[PDB]
Amino acid sequence: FDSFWFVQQWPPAVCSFQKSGSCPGSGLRTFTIHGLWPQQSGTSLTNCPGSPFDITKISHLQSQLNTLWPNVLRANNQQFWSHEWTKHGTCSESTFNQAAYFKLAVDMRNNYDIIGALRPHAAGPNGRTKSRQAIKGFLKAKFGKFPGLRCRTDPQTKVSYLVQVVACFAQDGSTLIDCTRDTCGANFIF
Ligand SMILES: O=c1ccn([C@@H]2O[C@H](CO)[C@@H](O)[C@H]2OP(=O)(O)O)c(=O)[nH]1
């Protein structure tokens, strides 16, 4: 791998697309971790053969993980962590063992407070239209590099909503670099 995509999701928006059934994310008001995805030549590396998920290796992080990395779609946090490890984490296991991988995601979340970086500039979430350039600009000013913005379009109204924010890191997992791909248009609701 040559870099990482640290992906955070906005729970209310994610769950807004679940028009049927329960969705725990509907009641959260902060960005939470979706995943830490190793990258290679502009694409995500997935399903690499590696070690099976072992909860005992991250037992010391259970408090932080239940708070910062909850499953927002269903009430089963461990299943989500196991899925993320098997699908993404194994691809960077040559340098980051399971414990280090989850610790890395936690440290990244604690050091990349999106709402805190937007609130002062009147760019916090309020269900109104935001500019892609403005949001990327505020985050670049605070963190030093451009983030990636990901959006989803509502099937009924065709309105675009911000659902995830990506912070791009070099292969060392600590050096921030500019992201280069957005799925958001010029404007979206946030
Ligand atoms: O909080 C969350 C956010 C996303 N997911 C993803 O959706 C699929 C549900 O079975 C899960 O497989 C997982 O897929 P991922 O996008 O890699 O594919 C959750 O389960 N919980």
Curated annotation (Swiss-Prot):
Effect of residue 73 to A: Decreased affinity for uridine (CpU substrate)
Gene3D superfamilies: Ribonuclease T2-like (3.90.730.10)
Catalytic activity entry: a ribonucleotidyl-ribonucleotide-RNA + H2O = a 3'-end 3'-phospho-ribonucleotide-RNA + a 5'-end dephospho-ribonucleoside-RNA + H(+)
Keyword annotations from UniProtKB, A to Z: Disulfide bond, Endonuclease, Hydrolase, Lyase, Nuclease, Signal
InterPro entries per the UniProt record, alphabetical: Ribonuclease_T2_eukaryotic, RNase_T2-like, RNase_T2-like_sf, RNase_T2_His_AS_1, RNase_T2_His_AS_2
Any Pfam family the entry gives: Ribonuclease_T2
GO CC annotations on file: extracellular region
Lineage: superkingdom: Eukaryota
Phenotype when changing residue 125 to A: Slightly decreased thermostability (at 47-58 degrees Celsius)
Consequence the record notes for mutating residue 165 to A: Slightly decreased thermostability (at 47-58 degrees Celsius)
Disulfide bonds: 15-23, 48-91, 151-184, 168-179
Natural source organism: Momordica charantia
Family from the record: Belongs to the RNase T2 family.
GO terms for biological process, alphabetical: RNA catabolic process
Main function: Ribonuclease cleaving preferentially the 5'-side of uridine.
Binding residues annotated for RNA, in chain numbering: 9, 34, 71-72, 74, 80, 83-84, 87-88
Main EC class the enzyme belongs to: lyase
Active site per database record: 34, 84, 88
Effect of residue 102 to A: Decreased thermostability (at 47-58 degrees Celsius)
Single GO term (MF): RNA binding
Misc remark: Has a remarkably high specificity toward CpU, ApU, and UpU.
Protein name: Ribonuclease MC
EC number(s) reported in the record: 4.6.1.19
